[PDB]
Design a binder for this molecule. Structure first.
Ligand SMILES: [Fe+2]
Ligand SMILES: [Fe+2]
Lengths: 260, 243
């Protein structure tokens, strides 16, 4: 199902500053990851954190519910990109808590800029990605819901007035993706090496946020760049990464992005 | 006392709530110390912490002149007591950031109750102590490198009599090697409430140890008094738990 705003609660800045202070300092425990990302599980039965610097506690308790919501966590990301990929009826809500301008999300053909307070529905089964082109903080609250007991996206709210499904979204404009531009991306066939394969993967993954092209093409480009490079082991690895990212196809155990 | 107020500043208890929340959750990890204490390095002679503490950062930046700013950190203390000592035989200022009613500092012959925002100078050369008789947070900004006549809260202590001294030496009937430390910390607290020089803590401990008839206790007490009152260094073989 396509991504869309479910509603939009207003956020009490000062009442919420100390909660972000906490979350930023909580240490939590320690692949295809880059940059800074971080999670603080809030619901999993609460956690030692809930009580710790509240407010969000209120929100997830005053805004949502129903006998089932199987999760909840903070989720920050600075100067990072998570490559496009599908995770595999498992609802999932996302709410950014602060103003981070160069922070975006993508899902199949769309690119969105979440604003403070909006509650978005995101689908796990589709090809998605997230990014932060800058170091400005982007703390978010994420709440997943449990179903297969037939629903209406309204019934995730404990109070149905919060539900406002028509708020318009910030959909960034993207430049047309020309054929000249595709050929230039293929020019990386000249410079890709096994020691920078991973770096190129991350670079290609960024293109769709600015240009009008499906993000799954990231993988087609990488495979072609690989063939242009004449490196057979690279071609094979770029094909496995693509089968893993858009096909959920399990990657071998011992599979390594940096040991060919 | 050689310590005194250096001029207040009133804290914006709203830009400060989040910083306090930051300082309280960060991991930091860390002999005569007991209870709860935690320090957050801010400026060493600047850290990943400074920018997540916007307001605190503003204050050390503009209220202070770095033309000799050695360093600054945050120091918290709950149900804790720093035994009275003199550091040796620089310039330290201290600013409590929260109202913790049962948190006190003492120096030579007076006891102080720092109120939020005041900027104090604490002398390291004379016998000093700090304590928090409760759990109420007492987050403080310590900056090591203007209104002096400001009136400080200098609690008024009760008279320390010979009768009280005697009750105190009754501890000689219960001291044991396993509660020696506890009694040290208990004794260290008397001067906050009673008008008696903090150093006398060590004289009671020594007199208590002698009445106990435990020579290893007497020698230990002497070592603590020399370390605390005379700044003599203890061995690395020294311990309050290993006899
Ligand atoms: Fe995912
Ligand atoms: Fe000291």
């Amino acid at each position: 199902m396509r991504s869309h705003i479910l509603g939009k609660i207003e956020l009490d800045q000062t009442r919420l500053a100390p909660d972000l202070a906490y979350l930023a300092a909580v240490p939590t425990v320690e692949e295809f990851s880059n940059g800074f990302w971080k999670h603080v599980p809030l619901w999993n039965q609460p956690t030692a954190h809930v009580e710790h610097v509240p407010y969000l506690k209120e929100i997830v308790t005053t805004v949502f519910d129903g006998t089932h919501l199987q999760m909840a966590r903070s989720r920050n990301l600075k100067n990072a990109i998570v490559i496009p990929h599908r995770d595999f009826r498992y609802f999932r809500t996302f709410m950014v808590l602060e103003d981070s301008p160069l922070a975006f999300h993508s899902n199949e053909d769309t690119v969105i800029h979440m604003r403070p307070g909006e509650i978005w529905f995101l689908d796990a089964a589709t090809v998605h990605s997230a990014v932060n082109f800058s170091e400005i903080s982007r703390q978010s609250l994420c709440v997943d819901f449990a179903f297969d007991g037939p629903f209406d996206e309204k019934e995730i709210f404990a109070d149905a007035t919060l539900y406002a499904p028509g708020s318009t979204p910030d959909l960034p404009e993207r430049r047309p993706f020309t054929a000249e531009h595709r050929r230039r991306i293929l020019s990386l066939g000249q410079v890709i090496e096994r020691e920078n394969f991973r770096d190129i993967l991350f670079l290609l993954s960024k293109v769709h946020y600015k240009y009008d092209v499906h993000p799954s093409e990231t993988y087609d480009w990488l495979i072609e760049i690989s063939k242009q490079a004449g490196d057979e082991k690279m071609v094979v690895k770029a094909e496995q990464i693509r089968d893993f990212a858009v096909e959920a196809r399990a990657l071998s155990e011992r599979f390594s992005l940096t040991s060919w």
